[PDB]
């Protein structure tokens, strides 16, 4: 029914030695982490990989963060990294969590009509742990022909989130850390304060991942949604800070057989900026 979302390190390592495969490092870190993803790629990466810069695949005209680009922009960029319609794209990142920003890129390719895409389970962390082969040097690829076309069903807008406060057609699940959702930990963006969307439920993205940074099983993921009173038989929308880690909610749903979980791309940054005071639920004190 669905093209597989996960591939293993061992399957990738074997495939390297043997529908072309394109490995993409989509690492991206918030400034306060003090890490530079592209610099790290140049030092060490999976052999043959290219670096997918999520800042080259976003709408910089927006005041909000990590917003989808238009289809032409995406297509041009994917093609420049050597992706074609026949390609099996496998995305990874080098996060401490295992996967962090890579699931956004999996979701983006699918939203743009490219369904033969997967994530490297455990990311570069696991790859390194296993002492698998690595390469260095700046990113490069020959170009390929790529077309894209956005399926709007992959997205919810601010207007949709606001209407749903009353209509209650879909469940909203927020992948931010618990303290950000509750209002007790800061938002990384200056001018944005923490808290959550009324009626939403928190499943921090780390809840989908084991202690080794691998994805939990579909069985454990279904249990996790059920315990949080999230019903995979009803409509579900994923949100987070800027629409990136929300994709872990989409992924865990997809692995559970529910492949139609849109992302609220605007996410908390947009919600906060466009809010009236009643729209911010927080243990913290509302802005004066
Ligand atoms: N360039 C940026 O988006 C940026 C720079 C400083 S703060 C920031 N972005 C944000 O604070 C958006 S909220 C946010 N974005 C993320 C992006 C990638 C991965 C995780 C997150 C997150 O938890 N929250
Ligand atoms: Na976004
Ligand atoms: Na580079
Ligand atoms: Na802030």
Distance CA 196, CA 204 (A): 12
For the chain, the domain total comes to 2
Do residue 78 and residue 134 come from a single domain? yes
CATH number of the domain to which 283 belongs? 3.40.250.10
Instruction: Please report which helix (H) or strand (E) contains residue 125, including its range.
Output: helix 123-129
Q: Is the minimum distance from the CB of 122 to ligand 1 under 6 angstroms?
A: no
> In what helix (H) or strand (E) does residue 50 lie, and over which residues does it extend?
strand 50-51
DSSP summary character for residue 21? E
Single residue among 150, 165, 192 that ends a domain in this structure: 150
Query: Alpha carbon of 13 to those of 10, 18, 141, 205, 215: distances in Å?
Result: 5, 9, 20, 27, 19
Domain check: are 266 and 163 in the same one?
yes
- Asked if residue 222 and residue 127 are part of one domain, the reply reads no
Resolution (A): 1.2
3-state secondary structure of 246: helix
**Is 229 found in the same domain as 131?**
no
Residue of 102, 107, 180, 188 to test ligand 1 pocket, by largest number of atoms within 8 Å of CB: 188
Q: Are 70 and 185 found together in one domain?
A: no
Taking a C-beta distance cutoff of 8 angstroms, is the pair 84, 56 a contact? no
Distance 197 CA to ligand 4 centre (A): 16
Q: Is 202 in the pocket of ligand 1 (CB under 6 A)?
A: no
Residue pointed to by tokens 């992959």? 154
**Nearest ligand by distance to the CA of 138:** 3
The whole-angstrom separation of Cα 112 and Cα 71 is 7
Query: To which residue do tokens 């979302």 refer?
Result: 5
Ligand 4 (ion): which residues have CB within 5 A?
Answer: 187, 192
Identify whether the C-beta of residue 244 lies closer than 8 Å to the C-beta of residue 269. Answer: no
Is the CB of residue 179 below 6 angstroms from any atom belonging to ligand 1?
Answer: no
Looking at ligand 1, which residue's alpha carbon is closest to its atom 22?
Answer: 241
What residues contact 192, with CB distance under 8 A and at least 6 apart?
268, 269, 272, 273
Query: How many CB atoms within 10 Å of residue 24?
Result: 29
Range of the domain at 59: 1-150
Which one, of 161, 226, 234, 232, lies nearest residue 199 by Cα?
Answer: 161
| Atom of ligand 1 at shortest range from CA of 54 | 18
Residues 10 and 122 in one domain: yes
Q: Distance between CA 190 and CA 257 in Å, rounded?
A: 38
Secondary structure element (H or E) that encloses residue 201, with its range: strand 201-202
Catalytic residues: 240
Q: Which residues pair with 135 in a beta bridge?
A: 45
As a whole number of angstroms, the distance between CA 222 and CA 236 comes to 14
Q: Which ligand is nearest to the CA of 269?
A: 1
The CA distance from 179 to 186, in Å, is 8
Method of determination used here: X-ray
Residues 100 and 172 in one domain: no
Task: Specify burial of residue 261 (Cβ count, 10 A radius: 0-12, 13-18, 19+).
Answer: buried
31 CB near ligand 1 (under 6 Å)? yes
Residue 56 Cβ < 6 Å to ligand 1: no
Q: Is 180 annotated as a binding residue?
A: yes
Q: Could you say which ligand is closest to the alpha carbon of residue 155?
A: 2
- Residues 144 and 82 occupy one common structural domain: yes
Ligand 1 atom 18 nearest Cα = 244
Terminal-to-terminal C-alpha distance of the chain: 51
Residue where one domain finishes, among candidates 124, 150, 176: 150
Residue 192 CA, closest ligand 1 atom number: 11
User: What span, in angstroms and rounded, lies between the C-alpha atoms of 249 and 242?
Assistant: 14
Residues across the chain: 288
Same-domain check for residues 73 and 210: no
Domain boundary among 89, 118, 150: 150
Handedness of CA 120, 124, 125, 126 (dihedral sign): positive
Burial class (CB in 10 A: 0-12, 13-18, 19+), 68: buried
Query: Is the CB of 152 within 6 Å of ligand 1?
Result: no
CA dist., res. 232 & res. 221, Å (int): 11
Buried b (16+ CB within 10 A) or exposed e, 115-128: eebbbbbbbbbbbe
């Amino acid at each position: 029914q669905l093209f597989r979302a996960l591939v293993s390190a061992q399957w990738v390592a074997e495939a390297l030695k043997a529908q072309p495969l394109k490995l993409l490092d989509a690492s991206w870190y918030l400034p306060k982490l003090g890490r530079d993803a592209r610099r790290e790629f140049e030092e060490r990466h999976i052999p043959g990989a290219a670096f997918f810069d999520i800042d080259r695949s976003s709408d910089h005209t927006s005041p909000y963060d990590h917003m989808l680009p238009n289809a032409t922009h995406f297509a041009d960029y994917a093609g420049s990294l050597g992706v074609s319609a026949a390609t099996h794209v496998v995305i990874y990142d080098g996060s401490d969590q295992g996967l962090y920003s890579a699931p956004r890129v999996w979701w983006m390719f699918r939203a743009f009509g490219h369904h033969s895409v997967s994530l490297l389970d455990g990311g570069f962390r696991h790859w390194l742990n296993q002492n698998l082969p690595i390469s260095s040097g700046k990113s490069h690829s020959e170009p390929a022909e790529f077309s894209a076309q956005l399926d709007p069903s992959f997205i919810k807008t601010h207007e949709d989130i606001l209407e749903n406060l009353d209509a209650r057609r879909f469940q909203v699940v927020d992948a931010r850390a618990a303290g950000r959702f509750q209002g007790t930990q800061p938002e990384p963006r200056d001018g944005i304060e923490p808290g959550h969307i009324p009626g939403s439920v928190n499943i921090p993205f780390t809840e989908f991942l084991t202690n080794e940074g691998l994805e939990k099983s579909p069985e454990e993921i279904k249990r996790l949604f059920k315990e949080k009173k999230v019903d995979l038989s009803k409509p579900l929308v994923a949100t987070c800070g800027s629409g990136v880690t929300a994709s872990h909610v989409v992924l865990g749903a997809f692995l559970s057989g529910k492949s139609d979980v849109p992302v609220y791309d605007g996410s908390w940054v947009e919600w906060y900026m466009r809010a009236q005071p009643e729209h911010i639920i927080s243990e913290g004190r509302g802005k004066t």
